[PDB]
Paper text:
Interleukin 4 (IL-4) is a pleiotropic cytokine that plays a major regulatory role in the immune system. Signal transduction of IL-4 is mediated by a sequential binding process, initiated first by binding of IL-4 to its high-affinity single membrane spanning receptor chain IL-4Rα. This intermediate ligand receptor complex then recruits one of two possible low-affinity receptor subunits, the common gamma chain (γc) or the IL-13Rα1 chain, into the functional hetero-trimeric complex to initiate signalling. The overall structure of IL-4 comprises the known four-helical bundle in up-up-down-down topology, which like the crystal packing is unaffected by these mutations.
We tested the interaction model proposed above by mutating Arg85 of IL-4 and the super-agonistic variants to alanine and measuring the residual binding affinity to IL-4Rα. If Arg85 is really involved in generating the additional stability/interaction, then, owing to cooperativity, mutation of this residue would have a greater effect in the super-agonistic variants (decrease in binding affinity) compared to wild-type IL-4. Here the equilibrium binding constant is increased almost 36-fold, mainly because of the increased dissociation rate (koff (F82D-R85A)/koff (F82D) ~ 9). To exclude the possibility that structural changes in addition to the removal of the Arg85 side chain play a role in the changes in binding stability, we determined the structures of the IL-4 variants R85A, T13D-R85A and F82D-R85A. No changes in the local structure around residues Thr/Asp13, Phe/Asp82 or Arg85 could be observed (data not shown).
Author numbering: 1 to 129
The structure:
């Protein structure tokens, strides 16, 4: 369960997300990682999946993000698609939908995703030899 290939699905998706720049990767998410580190793994996954769901729900049809050019629109849709795929894997890992997130700090989506990538890669590393 804990070292399931879902971890690779998440990392693969994050690897793509972090190479993607759009009109709105600087808009913010609640920084779940600004905590002093006091939650179970499932709780961390639930919290990340929660703030990402907020983000894609709020920005999928946001006039600031939708794009003027074909390329801008494509990149927007690709980002939304990937966030939903990432989110779907996170909820699968969390096994939990109820996790309040109380952090004040907002970080850019771009910074959040790089941090979550680091945490996910660290989990993968602790699973393999």
């Amino acid at each position: 369960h804990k070292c399931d290939i879902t971890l690779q699905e998440i990392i693969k998706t994050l690897n793509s997300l972090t190479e993607q720049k759009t009109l709105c990767t600087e808009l913010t998410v609640t920084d779940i990682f600004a905590a002093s580190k006091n939650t179970t793994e499932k709780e961390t996954f639930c919290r990340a999946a929660t703030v990402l769901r907020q983000f894609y729900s709020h920005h999928e049809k946001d006039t600031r993000c939708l794009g003027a050019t074909a390329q801008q629109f494509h990149r927007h849709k690709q980002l939304i698609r990937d966030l939903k795929a990432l989110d779907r894997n996170l909820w699968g890992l969390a096994g939990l939908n109820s996790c309040p997130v109380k952090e004040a700090n907002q970080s850019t989506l771009e910074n959040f995703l790089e941090r979550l990538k680091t945490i996910m890669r660290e989990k993968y590393s602790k699973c393999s030899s």
